[PDB]
Design a protein around this ligand. Structure first.
Ligand SMILES: CCCCC[C@H](CC(=O)NO)C(=O)N1[C@@H]2CC[C@@H](C2)[C@H]1C(=O)N[C@H](C(=O)O)c1ccccc1
Ligand SMILES: [Zn+2]
Ligand SMILES: [Zn+2]
Length: 201
């Protein structure tokens, strides 16, 4: 689920960054590797911020709200990295938001691909499962990507770990497709990022 709005797309795919204070050297290196991981497979580029007006700030802060999708413009935008959301794959997910990706399970067509088990959602967190409105999103021809780094796990915001909130609707290669990986960018994440930033083939 890529943003459909041209203004949230970072010009030339160049995203300047600041790493804020209070992080360990170790944590700082993981941020660098996460940005690099985006660069290895796409034409998106992360540059140390010199005098750019719009840029991202890795901010030492409790995990949660909110990661702006794409380029907000007219100033810095913060990425909240705390104790429990500082691992490489989580950072790659957050940088997914930064480059212009919503959560995959909120695609306007998601109901053809997953069931949402409402009764299992933590009360007050159901808004996290609302479909994006169709004007806000573009698929760019990409199929629903169960493997996306932007896809929720089976039990995200569940009342308990053994209760599913998201259940894929069909089998892929004889098997119910696994969801919620935070290891690397999927084939789909790369293909969709390349399309959104018009990366040379
Ligand atoms: C229980 C609290 C829920 C936190 C919201 C979510 C956190 C996330 O996904 N982190 O990786 C988020 O920040 N979101 C949702 C997923 C992508 C969008 C929606 C992002 C969000 O709220 N974006 C806003 C926007 O881009 O319009 C926004 C972010 C920051 C400031 C203002 C608006
Ligand atoms: Zn997210
Ligand atoms: Zn994808």
């Amino acid at each position: 689920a890529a943003t459909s709005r041209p203004e949230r797309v970072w010009p030339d795919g160049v995203i300047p960054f600041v790493i804020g204070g209070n992080f360990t050297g170790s944590q700082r290196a993981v941020f660098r590797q996460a940005m690099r991981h985006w660069e290895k497979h796409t034409c998106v580029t992360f540059l140390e911020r010199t005098d750019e007006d719009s840029y991202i700030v890795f901010t030492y802060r409790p995990c949660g709200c909110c990661s702006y999708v794409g380029r907000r413009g007219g100033g810095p935008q913060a990425i909240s990295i705390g104790k429990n959301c500082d691992k490489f794959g989580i950072v790659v997910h957050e940088l997914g938001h930064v480059v212009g990706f919503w959560h995959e399970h909120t695609r306007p067509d998601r109901d053809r691909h997953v069931s949402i088990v409402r009764e299992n959602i933590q009360p007050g967190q159901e808004y996290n499962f609302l479909k994006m409105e169709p004007q806000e999103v573009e698929s760019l021809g990409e199929t629903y990507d169960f493997d996306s780094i932007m896809h929720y796990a089976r039990n995200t915001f569940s009342r308990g770990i053994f209760l599913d909130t998201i259940v894929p609707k069909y089998e892929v290669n004889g098997v119910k497709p696994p969801i919620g990986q935070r290891t690397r960018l999927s084939k789909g994440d790369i293909a969709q990022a390349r399309k959104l930033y018009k990366c040379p083939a």
